[PDB]
Amino acid sequence: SDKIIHLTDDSFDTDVLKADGAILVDFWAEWCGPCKMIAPILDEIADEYQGKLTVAKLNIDQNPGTAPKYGIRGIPTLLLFKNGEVAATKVGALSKGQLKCFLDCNL
Numbered sequence: 001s002d003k004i005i006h007l008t009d010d011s012f013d014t015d016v017l018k019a020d021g022a023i024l025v026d027f028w029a030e031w032c033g034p035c036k037m038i039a040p041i042l043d044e045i046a047d048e049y050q051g052k053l054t055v056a057k058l059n060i061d062q063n064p065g066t067a068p069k070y071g072i073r074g075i076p077t078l079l080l081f082k083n084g085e086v087a088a089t090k091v092g093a094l095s096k097g098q099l100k101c102f103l104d105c106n107l
């Protein structure tokens with residue numbers, strides 16, 4: 001969890017929208033079982049992809065406003081930004097194999 005950027009509604013424009021290169025933003029909440037299931041998987045990808053992209057999470061309990069500006073309907077939802085614009089999204093829980101499948105396709 002040391003390799004994962006903590007986002008807030010206020011920090012978002014700077015950390016994501018203005019970042020150069022690729023960011024994988026994880027929308028999640030403590031009440032979200034399937035969001036917690038993929039947290040470890042996300043830590044390994046921060047690891048293995050450390051030279052390719054940044055991983056970020058935004059808690060929707062404590063930050064209610066950013067997700068609607070993206071039409072996100074419930075969590076987990078992963079958004080891949082490239083230079084502050086969404087390139088692709090993946091809704092629902094997934095496995096390690098499915099997550100790197102998703103990444104290896106847009107990097």
Ligand SMILES: [Cu+2]
Pocket residue numbers: 001002003004043
């Ligand atoms: Cu860590």
